[PDB]
Symmetry: C2
Subunit: 255 residues, 2 copies
């Protein structure tokens, strides 16, 4: 049998235009980001999607994105489950820093590795970090399946997959095998981690995969829950590639 | 008390101003109703409420109310569960009708009986009813714990309690006993039904209970989940009483 699923990363937030790593900072979507969610909902409605379950991270921007999509579909009653295991990759000390500034300071090559490599680990976030308290003092991280003091302080994409894969295998994949229609409202890198696994993308090739914000990602899996083909982006392909280039360019110096 | 619970009915919808029985019609909250939800959230935040689980009906206005409350609390991550068993009382054929016009035609006392009686069952909604289709052709009622054909077509307040109690016993009560702080986002009459059970209100006294829209209701329970005292509306009592009178006045000529 063949199964289809939808995953996407939420829309824009304030730090997007500012070009700052957001990661675990619980920033809300801005007007534009909310509209992006509604657009995704409208596309899914057009395809007559009837979701059975929705999975999100515990970062409110992914949750609000799901809620907006469900409203566009008139499916607000559909069960939603949120887990830190779908949280965006933890950028550690890099959180809050400007990507272009990092390019000027450390070079475009190093920034590309920090952002897209599989094994490179960002420096861990310190208690002195401006956004440390706001993150680790929140109750949502006191009731995770992992103690507060044991949650990551930074993550390589490999680290993300290691804490995300179990959640996929144990709580999402079973529903897919049951023929349920699932929506995963996630983030840029946590989505890349999942795709790397499902599509069998190599450590080297994953570095060139960049996902645009607020765009439905369609994926078809086979009986062995493996991608039948590469992931596809729903929408105008030219605007999608342009959005991807925009994200890539955030890590480059002006030319 | 040993445990604390919060329940409430959502804010205004378009049919509030039109003064029409909404019931199972999946009407959305209007601007004012959304604001009412934000006010509940702010009031609960001011009292340090930290929810562990939220229960709602499958009518979107109660779900959106919960979502707006959680946003104000910065608790969007809190688990939410929805069930038709928390749905508002089914007004059957009376759905869509104007309360004041009905009071004019049949008498204020007659309408008050239909609205607040514990025992009187409204006439069942027929397939010929203008809103029958919009209700029973929705997928949410194809995946309930009972077949679509088994869902009610009208309910007395007693009928409501009979189908709501199983959910309280099976899903909600256990969580409360575990010490979890629960929020129940329900409706006018489904909430009256639960209160009757928790406070041991008699069939006669329940008729006099009218709940204001968008006002948190605090209930303190003992080890046996029995109310230790009457429910407590959280807010300015004068404004809350005016809000209650507002609902009562919808049935007056």
């Amino acid at each position: 049998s063949k199964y289809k699923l939808i995953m996407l990363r939420h829309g824009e937030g304030a730090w997007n235009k500012e070009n700052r790593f957001c990661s675990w900072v619980d920033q809300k979507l801005n007007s534009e980001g909310m509209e992006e969610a509604r657009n995704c909902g409208k596309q899914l409605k057009a395809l007559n999607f009837e979701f059975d379950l929705v999975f999100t991270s515990v970062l409110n921007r992914s949750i609000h994105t799901a809620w907006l999509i469900l409203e566009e579909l008139g499916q607000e009653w559909v069960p939603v489950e949120s887990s830190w295991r779908l949280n965006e990759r933890h950028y550690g000390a890099l959180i809050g820093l400007n990507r272009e500034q990092m390019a000027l300071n450390h070079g475009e090559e190093q920034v590309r590795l920090w952002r897209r490599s599989y094994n490179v680990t960002p420096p861990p976030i310190e208690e002195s970090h401006p956004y440390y308290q706001e993150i680790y003092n929140d109750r949502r991280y006191k009731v995770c399946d992992v103690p507060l003091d044991q949650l990551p302080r930074s993550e390589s994409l490999k680290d993300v997959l290691e804490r995300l894969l179990p959640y996929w295998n144990e709580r999402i994949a079973p529903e897919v095998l049951r023929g349920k229609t699932i929506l995963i409202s996630a983030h840029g890198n946590s989505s890349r981690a999942l795709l790397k696994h499902l599509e069998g993308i190599s450590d080297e090739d994953i570095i060139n995969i960049t996902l645009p914000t607020g765009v439905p990602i369609l994926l078809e899996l086979d009986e062995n829950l493996r991608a039948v083909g590469p992931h596809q982006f729903l929408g105008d392909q030219e605007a999608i590639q342009a959005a991807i280039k925009k994200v890539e360019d955030q890590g480059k110096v002006k030319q």
